[PDB]
Amino acid sequence: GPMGSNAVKVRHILCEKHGKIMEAMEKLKSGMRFNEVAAQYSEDKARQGGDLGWMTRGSMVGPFQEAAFALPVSGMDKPVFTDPPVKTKFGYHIIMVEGRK
Ligand code: NA
Ligand code: NA
Known part of the structure; x- marks a missing residue:
């Protein structure tokens, strides 16, 4: 849908x-x-500065997805990130969002 x-x-x-x-x-x-x-x-995407690129709904692990769609778009001079870190089966993530569709 x-x-x-x-x-x-x-x-x-x-x-x-x-x-x-x-x-x-x-x-x-x-x-x-x-x-x-x-x-x-970061233990993932370190050489890309943590950038995962565009990720559609359903493609991210649950706790990460819920945290990501709750964040407004920000930029790296004025970031808005998850605090506290979000735990998933991969470990602990700090997330920011640079674009939204
Ligand atoms: Na998980
Ligand atoms: Na630990």
Whole structure:
């Protein structure tokens, strides 16, 4: 149905360990740009600055999807990200959304 046409352009920092995702969160809260935090800490898409690109509804793991569609579009100078980090079967994610359909 129509909700399957919904999508987000999404960027994340993924860390297996809670301690490490919290380190990443401290860097974001210090002002570090999201892509730079992802380069330092993310275990997925690190070389893309955490960018997952466009992801349609149904393509993301449940807790990640619910968190992502709840975030407004933001940019890396004025980010709006998940706090606290979101736990999935992959680990802990910090997410921001750069586009919405
Ligand atoms: Na842990
Ligand atoms: Na999960």
